[PDB]
Amino acid sequence: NLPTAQEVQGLMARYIELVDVGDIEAIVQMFADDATVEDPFGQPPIHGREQIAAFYRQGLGKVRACLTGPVRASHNGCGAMPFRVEMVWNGQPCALDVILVMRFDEHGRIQTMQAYWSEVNLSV
Amino acid sequence: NLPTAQEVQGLMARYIELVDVGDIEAIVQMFADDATVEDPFGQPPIHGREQIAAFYRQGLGKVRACLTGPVRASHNGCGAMPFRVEMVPCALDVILVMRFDEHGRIQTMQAYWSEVNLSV
């Protein structure tokens, strides 16, 4: 709980913005110190800011990202949003369609994050 | 969680199709006996076929629905999709997250949305 539906809308919209510019440390800061990330969902959860920062640094360490639909928020501090990421793999432009689901804590920080996507969502 | 990524895409797309035509019996058949529905997510879990059937009865019992983006599937039998529901004259943007069992039936259904996502 804590963040209202509107606040969730704002936090998740900002996440996309941070990912887009690639500000790794600002992204990490949005996460609870002990948050867990599953990206893609189905893979082992990654625990803690050190591990999360290493994760984003690997992926974002050249990439554009934008919402492709509005954020769907709840009244219990959770939300979901659809988005697309554009990256350059092997010097070639690729697109990845994803849907992120997040649960925030009483301090407005991301406690849980789950990114839904597979190969079928990747394209050029 | 046996259903593959492509099979999840198909099942989730069929669900939307069924909702769009309003075939409650067909929709309910898609769920497993132990299934739980959280719609909107944040509201108490609904379980029991008679209960899930009654939930759809009240909602679809003129309603239309369409995918507004591709289904995002995983390899552990789960998927998420963005869609729009038109009903009463208004529109609602939703995102459904679902987990299927080893039989390809809905085990978990979670629909995210709130008043903000509503448009009249």
Side-chain angles (χ1 to χ4, degrees), chain B residues 96-109:
Chain B
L96 263 173
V97 173
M98 292 163 65
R99 187 185 193 79
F100 292 87
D101 60 29
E102 52 297 316
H103 310 88
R105 310 189 81 184
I106 306 168
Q107 199 175 57
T108 299
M109 185 266 232

Side-chain angles (χ1 to χ4, degrees), chain A residues 5 9 41-42 68 70-76 78-83 97-99 101 103 116-121, chain B residues 5-6 9 41-42 68 70-76 78 80-83 93-95 97 99 112-117:
Chain A
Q9 295 164 58
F41 182 66
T68 48
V71 175
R72 274 69 155 188
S74 298
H75 292 296
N76 60 178
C78 296
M81 73 188 140
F83 65 103
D97 288 333
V98 185
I99 274 178
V101 182
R103 177 176 215 100
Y116 289 88
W117 63 271
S118 70
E119 296 63 39
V120 299
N121 291 101
Chain B
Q6 306 182 180
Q9 288 185 146
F41 183 73
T68 51
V71 169
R72 274 70 161 190
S74 74
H75 294 294
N76 66 175
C78 302
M81 66 185 152
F83 63 107
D93 294 310
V94 186
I95 272 183
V97 173
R99 187 185 193 79
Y112 291 75
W113 62 270
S114 71
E115 310 68 30
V116 300
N117 300 124

Side-chain angles (χ1 to χ4, degrees), chain B residues 20-34:
Chain B
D20 192 45
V21 297
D23 194 318
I24 295 68
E25 278 65 51
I27 294 175
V28 172
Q29 205 71 46
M30 286 193 85
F31 293 73
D33 315 307
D34 44 297

